[PDB]
């Protein structure tokens, strides 16, 4: 490299630019553009021995019955022969509310007294003006008029109808008080979702004065959120400060245009009250639009970091060129990612990696330019080739290790089981490696190519540079030596507090919300302010969510859990079923299945509801449907000779459908037969007693004990292989478990590689262990701060844990390699010399990414501000901790005890 | 309980509307993906047309299948000794107009057993009674009943 780089940099510059442009063209030509359709694109784990079973079950539910020639496992359709050939006064509510329709909750202003009657009239009129005043396909339109089909679906409509008026807005408000008393007396009653199309009700009527199909609505679906069961006093009449409004229309992708054009720019609703929850179903839809638009904050970031890079070294052109180098590295890495390895995915986080990428990049260039200036300081009138050789010898390996650290960090993050982070890991890792190599080649060339009113500004630059110089020259050593215990004690205490907040106090916890509702936007944005603050305030939602949902046991026999889905890093697409090599027909086979149901009828988790006829195992169902004579199939043993069995199975199940057919929609115990006549799979299920929690431990206890039992098959040779298959709906469980285990093992690999490279660089065990103490304290205090800010684990803030270690060791490695100029004292002069030598280097290398992430912060898409805050914290801590601590501890230890093997390496 | 007159829509609004009907989504073939959604009725009490001999009527949407069975059992009560006749449930040859709901399977045109006239007018209102979505007196030859689909 140095051989012919001497005054011939144009060749390498040109070949690099050609490489860049050709790889860019190939990347935009051959592979298919990324989707960005759904943020939760690849969260479902793969190859985790449960997600294996789970994905097989889902793949099975896909290839369900097709009426004629289903052409898969489902059913018996082959035997089709069968031996033969408002503005209105009343009655005004078309339907009852449900989750399907779109909705919006309203919050009051400082008035905070929501039962204000102008509050109600304003509510309805502003709603209609803000929503209905637009081209709308319409609503159910029970009458001919498509305008006042469903009027606003508001409580104002209710109070109007109790007033029995064709017009909602006209409200003298006396009936408001009447119905207020009525609602009190009704909340006293616990009062049903009666039909009540007429006044008479089949169930017992608590009081006729309760208007039919009205009070239950306001109490259970409508604006009332505070559960309205206080028993305090009439004076204690609350305001119901939260109020909800259903849209007369229905929620779906269509409403996207309406919200975008009609409901964003609006600063609020009105001074009487304002919107706070906008649940229109369309969250994932416009997501990518906000993503695209809100991307100028990374632009402000890259421009300000370019500016401060200029501030560092006045060689503006060098700054621009290395910035372009970073970007081109991103591009060629993308090309390598999608193309070179034939695997493709792009899980929305690679559009956040770029920030830490450019951070590490700008980091690795500062060291090089400063080493260049240092070697140019002494013997400047030397050979350019020799200058290149020496500055390379002194900086290239430093660059290589200080990047390969995070490189190995990400190539370790690869080990997890989430796809949506396997991809991120591989991409960013190749990115950082290519960044390193492109730097070590490109940057030397462009550097050597730099052959080259303002006076007062230049003077202030000079003076401030000297100020920084003296600051790093006297101040910092003075501090660290003059205390030499204060920082160390303070940081021991902070490590204690971090370990404490992570261990027993409100600590790192797994996700809580359901899979499809990960808060993807800024928590202050209305769409998700709906969740986590309002969804748990509504009778229908809350009393519906997390209630008497006995999760089902389940078992399969026809298939085998082979995820033919691109196992190593699937594309979050691609599955295919198969068949086993069993035969249900054997007498011992059905006998064993019967006895199996028998044994399972004795267990703890069971729940003998005693209302089923056809939902449990169908063998007993045969048994009951047996002893049916004169058709002919009857008067036999409970096992069968496989012949009566084969003739009777299809006959009987078809006769069950013929008596009164009940849909069997690929969830039922329905056995599985194929296009031609043969049963192939034997699905059957049950009912547990665990009530479908979300926290880990309960689910784990459940699944562990259940699979523990079912693993004991001990069946006969037929259908005896790998048939265990117990699988509930415990997908969320699987995500959670693998997320925890993945972040753990990834952190492990990262600290391992950090310590190993620390050995391979410093060759001293002692200072390596001290750096380990350092980085451990750093990660502890930073994750403690995170959890203090209430940040559950997700797909995103998992990789942050592991990348924190790589980012952290980046400073300890310098302060370690800087143990030169061996003085008389074992401790005193060496550490202050190292500090004074690497001060500005490390400080600027931190402050760059700090200010980048800092200006990044205010945005909308969560991922951006998430990563911004994380990097701000990790950089601040890593710098301050690294310096103060890893010199303080070193101030009180003598590292002259080491182990050296070969003096050949240099650095 | 009236003999629904000529050209009378019961939901009071055109078919392709979100009121009880929604709108058409996609074609269906014998090999399409979404074709799994369809199931055969095979209720022996009903007589099918099957002029295509491929079961164009004998299969339909399960959501529509249950409603049709409801109407069958409900009209067996009010009219004894009748055998309902579905003329076209799901069309793939294209005997109906393009973009028609019959191509989707959420609809079927229904006639009585012995091709009676006033029985059509009463049977429309009956189809309303069983809980059908968009029952329209499409033709003098057949009563047209169309349902919404789930999901
Ligand atoms: C557009 C990018 C992606 C590719 C090309 C970037 C560089 C290779 C270009 C941009 C600016 C160019 C420079 C612009 C101006 C000059 C000064 C010029 O000076 C003289 O000829 C000296 C005259 C004298 O003093 O007698 C020599 C070429 C040079 C260094 C050029 C060399 C090629 C450079 C560095
Ligand atoms: C300014 C550069 C040098 C650095 C930052 C790059 C980002 C601004 C780029 C990189 C990835 C880009 C995204 C890649 C893929 C897509 C999908 C793409 O989808 C469509 O085109 C479908 C919808 C439509 O037609 O608009 C829309 C742009 C978007 C979001 C892009 C938005 C702009 C992004 C975030
Ligand atoms: C060799 C030099 C250039 C260093 C390369 C470092 C990385 C770019 C390597 C290290 C591990 C590699 C991965 C190891 C294994 C696989 C699985 C491979 O697919 C399979 O093996 C599918 C199943 C099979 O056929 O066995 C696709 C490439 C990939 C992701 C590799 C992509 C490239 C990776 C990340
Ligand atoms: C994992 C991969 C991507 C790392 C690639 C790193 C290379 C670009 C670096 C690492 C070691 C470097 C070498 C380290 C030492 C030397 C010897 C140096 O010459 C001398 O030291 C001889 C005179 C003297 O003894 O002072 C010339 C540069 C060279 C070949 C360096 C060239 C650039 C090298 C190969
Ligand atoms: C940066 C490093 C050094 C510390 C933080 C990373 C992990 C070591 C942390 C982050 C999330 C933590 C987990 C968060 C929640 C739980 C569930 C919790 O559940 C129970 O108490 C049930 C019983 C059981 O799990 O055995 C057990 C600890 C565990 C797995 C924690 C173990 C420690 C984890 C993996
Ligand atoms: C004493 C000096 C050297 C400290 C230098 C660093 C501070 C200026 C940084 C460190 C941590 C930062 C804080 C980290 C996170 C946040 C949360 C942020 O708000 C959110 O992210 C809210 C998200 C949610 O609603 O959950 C507002 C800024 C703040 C307080 C930051 C303010 C600036 C702080 C204090
Ligand atoms: C001695 C100080 C001045 C300098 C050295 C330490 C600072 C660089 C950092 C280290 C850890 C940081 C703290 C990490 C986390 C938090 C919690 C954070 O809490 C909240 O904003 C939310 C509080 C809540 O609502 O519970 C406020 C900032 C603070 C104290 C940070 C303040 C700045 C600190 C002390
Ligand atoms: C509660 C009440 O009086 N509602 C009235 C009703 O009495 C009257 O018959 C109808 C016709 O004007 O208008 C409404
Ligand atoms: C701005 O918001 C306030 C409520 O904070 C509202 O009263 C005002 O009308 C809004 N501005 C405009 C121009 O409507
Ligand atoms: C199940 O347990 C009950 C109570 O111990 C016992 O009466 C019954 O016989 C058992 N049945 C089977 C099939 O084990
Ligand atoms: C199914 O069995 C029939 C015999 O009834 C045979 O003609 C057909 O090829 C078989 N198809 C498959 C996929 O095995
Ligand atoms: Zn028709």
Author numbering:
A (entry chain D): 181 to 265, 285 to 389, 400 to 661, 687 to 865, 873 to 1148
B (entry chain G): 39 to 189
Sentences from the paper on this structure:
After the application of an adapted mask on ECDs and Shh for focused 3D classification, we solved the structure of the complex at an overall resolution of 4.07 Å. In the hDisp1NNN–Shh complex structure, the two ECDs of hDisp1 grasp Shh like a pincer, with the N-terminus of Shh facing upwards and close to ECD1 and the C-terminus of Shh facing downwards and close to the SSD. Upon Shh binding to hDisp1, Shh acts as a “molecular glue” that pulls the two ECDs of hDisp1NNN, turning them inwardly towards each other by approximately 4–5 Å. A comparison between the structures of hDisp1NNN-3C-cleaved and that of the hDisp1NNN–ShhN complex reveals conformational shifts of the two ECDs, whereas no substantial conformational change in the TMDs is observed. However, our structure reveals an extensive protein–protein interaction between hDisp1 and Shh. This interaction involves two interfaces, one primarily between residues 336–343 of ECD1 and residues 50–58 of Shh, and the other primarily between residues 242–249/260–265 of ECD1 and residues 68–81 of Shh. Although Shh was palmitate- and cholesterol-modified, we could not resolve the two lipid modifications, and thus any protein–lipid interactions between hDisp1 and Shh. Importantly, the Shh-binding site in hDisp1 clashes with the density corresponding to the uncleaved C-loop in the hDisp1NNN-3C structure, which provides an explanation for the drastically reduced Shh binding that we observed for uncleaved hDisp1NNN-3C.
The membrane protein Dispatched (Disp), which belongs to the RND family of small molecule transporters, is essential for Hedgehog (Hh) signaling, by catalyzing the extracellular release of palmitate- and cholesterol-modified Hh ligands from producing cells. Also uniquely among RND proteins, Disp activity requires Furin-mediated cleavage at a conserved site in its first large extracellular domain (ECD1), yielding a mature Disp protein consisting of two non-covalently associated fragments.
